[PDB]
Design an enzyme around this catalytic site. Structure first.
Site, mmCIF file in Angstrom:
data_model
loop_
_atom_site.group_PDB
_atom_site.id
_atom_site.type_symbol
_atom_site.label_atom_id
_atom_site.label_comp_id
_atom_site.label_asym_id
_atom_site.label_seq_id
_atom_site.Cartn_x
_atom_site.Cartn_y
_atom_site.Cartn_z
ATOM 1 N N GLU A 35 0.817 -1.191 0.000
ATOM 2 C CA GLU A 35 0.000 0.000 0.000
ATOM 3 C C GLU A 35 0.852 1.242 0.000
ATOM 4 O OE1 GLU A 35 -3.095 0.327 -0.524
ATOM 5 O OE2 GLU A 35 -3.789 -1.717 -0.324
ATOM 6 N N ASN A 46 -7.572 9.849 -5.921
ATOM 7 C CA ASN A 46 -8.244 9.079 -6.951
ATOM 8 C C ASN A 46 -9.120 10.066 -7.733
ATOM 9 O OD1 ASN A 46 -7.417 6.318 -5.631
ATOM 10 N ND2 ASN A 46 -8.488 7.454 -3.970
ATOM 11 N N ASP A 49 -12.874 9.357 -8.745
ATOM 12 C CA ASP A 49 -13.981 9.401 -7.764
ATOM 13 C C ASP A 49 -13.895 10.461 -6.665
ATOM 14 O OD1 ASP A 49 -12.163 8.115 -5.937
ATOM 15 O OD2 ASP A 49 -13.815 7.107 -4.940
ATOM 16 N N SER A 51 -11.721 10.917 -4.160
ATOM 17 C CA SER A 51 -11.372 10.544 -2.790
ATOM 18 C C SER A 51 -9.866 10.409 -2.723
ATOM 19 C CB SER A 51 -12.001 9.211 -2.408
ATOM 20 O OG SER A 51 -11.391 8.155 -3.139
ATOM 21 N N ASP A 53 -6.477 8.367 -0.604
ATOM 22 C CA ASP A 53 -6.015 7.332 0.309
ATOM 23 C C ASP A 53 -4.854 7.953 1.066
ATOM 24 O OD1 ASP A 53 -7.753 5.421 -0.834
ATOM 25 O OD2 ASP A 53 -6.198 4.801 -2.230
ATOM 26 N N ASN A 60 -9.022 5.178 3.003
ATOM 27 C CA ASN A 60 -9.898 6.017 2.171
ATOM 28 C C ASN A 60 -10.734 7.121 2.836
ATOM 29 O OD1 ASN A 60 -13.038 5.815 1.618
ATOM 30 N ND2 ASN A 60 -12.001 6.261 -0.322
#
Length: 130
Positions: A35, A46, A49, A51, A53, A60
């Site tokens: 990750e 992202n 969409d 959002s 991380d 998220n």
């Protein structure tokens, strides 16, 4: 902060991650490696969409933490996303525990499914004295 493998392993063990909800420490280590590469500053927006991380476990902003700019955010961990970018991983760890308490568990992370699940992940914890 970019953790050294064994350093992170012992830290997670002291934070109660080993075997948490049935998840072995090696699995948690495999997830943080893929990750974020053990980097607490890791962020990934992202664009598709809206959002982002955040941190070590790449948690998220739509459901776990609040960054104020993600539509429909839930803030299940009741934490500012900023809290997941600190050198002290205590908050990111408490939030990661919360994510896995949902039905899917560790499978919530696609990367876990792709790079850890059903693999020999012993190497993530090897030699760390954990």
């Amino acid at each position: 902060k970019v953790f050294e493998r064994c350093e992170l392993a012992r830290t997670l063990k002291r934070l109660g991650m080993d075997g948490y909800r049935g998840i072995s420490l090696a699995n948690w280590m495999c997830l943080a490696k893929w990750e974020s590469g053990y980097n607490t500053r890791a962020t990934n927006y992202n664009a598709g969409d809206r959002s982002t991380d955040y941190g070590t476990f790449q948690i998220n902003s739509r459901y776990w933490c609040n960054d104020g700019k993600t539509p429909g955010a839930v803030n299940a961990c009741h934490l500012s996303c900023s809290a997941l970018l600190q050198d002290n991983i205590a908050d990111a760890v408490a939030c990661a525990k919360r994510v896995v308490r949902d039905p899917q568990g560790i499978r919530a992370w696609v990367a876990w499914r792709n790079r850890c699940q059903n693999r020999d992940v012993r190497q993530y914890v090897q030699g760390c004295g954990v």
